[PDB]
Structure 1
Amino acid sequence: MQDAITAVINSADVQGKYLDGAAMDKLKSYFASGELRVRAASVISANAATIVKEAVAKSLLYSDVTRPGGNMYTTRRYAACIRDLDYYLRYATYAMLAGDASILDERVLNGLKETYNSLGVPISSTVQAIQAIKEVTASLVGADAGKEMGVYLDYICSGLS
């Protein structure tokens, strides 16, 4: 997985040139955004479980999926759903800190679609749950960090769908 710094370095290395002014400026921009990214990551780390709690409450609970016959009915399947949303939140935080979606591509979405298709997990419902994660995290962290957090979450949703 490549962060913004790694992306700049890779772009320079492909042409085999030292760090130009453009790479200088991009690194400075990432350094400027670093404070906001770190604060958002710390807040989300502190409130990770709760965010998933309101997300599932807003999105999934008291639905056919949670009722018997739905994928989230069993206690094991509900725990798996909570764990999946925790994965989505944590890896979105990772993408926020890195400034790139490379980690999401390589780890989160490597075989997620195939495994969901095999296991019968409802892609539409999980996308809706991730979206609700997006609104809750945006509310908790503010619009400024919430915009990029939602960008990463929408990337995950688009890849999964």
Structure 2
Amino acid sequence: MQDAITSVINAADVQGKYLDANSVEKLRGYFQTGELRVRAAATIAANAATIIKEAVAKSLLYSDITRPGGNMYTTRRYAACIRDLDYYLRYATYGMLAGDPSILDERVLNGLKETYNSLGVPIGATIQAIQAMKEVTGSLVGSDAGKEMGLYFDYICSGLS
């Protein structure tokens, strides 16, 4: 659980040296985007339910995982999805603010693909839901902010694959 400042301090500390010009050079780069990330995390908090409603209706709403036999049939199983998609849109918001994807594999990625295989959850439909959820997130926060929030979505999709 490290942000961009924590990761910069760790690497500069792990060699026992002070924060030289290169370490502060990245820190200044993070502070420049500090204004963009909060507004990105602002609108995502507002439209959390709307984004997840848009992703599932755009990716896996009417596919036969939704029908009987599919992986999402029963109401408990459907309700687990939007609960499950809420974490991906939420933890991706944390990575967008912290500027470092360490929180994702610390709290989301580890034991995740090994868990879906246990339950039999289709990893293929899961990533496309996150990809569609990444597509709507670029709608709200804009282009570059979508590039930032989108940079952690595919990090989840990559490791979850």
TM-score (norm 1): 0.98
Secondary structure, counterpart of 1:43 in structure 2: helix
- Equivalent AA in structure 2 for residue 89 of structure 1: L
Match of 2:56 in 1: 56
Matching of residue 137 in structure 1 with residue 151 in structure 2: no
- Give the residue type in structure 1 aligned to 2:48: A
CA distance in 1, matches of 2:25, 2:4: 12
Q: For this pair of structures, how many residues does the alignment match?
A: 161
1:83 aligns with 2:83: yes
1:21-58 alpha-carbon deviations (Å, 9 max, x no partner): 11112111111100000100011001111000000000
Deviates more, 1:19-28 or 1:101-110: 19-28
1:157 corresponds to which residue?
A: 157
Counterpart for residue 115 of structure 1: 115
The corresponding residue for 2:46 is 46
Letter paired with 1:127: I
The structure 1 segments of at least 4 consecutive aligned residues displaced by more than 6 Å after TM superposition are none
Per the alignment, residue 37 of structure 2 pairs with 37
The runs of 5 or more residues in structure 2 that have no matched partner are none
Identity %: 84
Q: What is the CA–CA distance in structure 1 between the aligned matches of 2:58 and 2:154, rounded to whole Å?
A: 18
Offset at residue 59 of structure 1 (A): 0.6
Which AA in structure 1 matches 2:147?
K
Q: How far did 1:141 drift?
A: 1.0
CA distance in 1, matches of 2:33, 2:25: 12
Letter aligned with residue 70 of structure 2: G
Q: Which runs of 5+ in 1 are unaligned?
A: none
Partner AA of 2:97 in structure 1: L
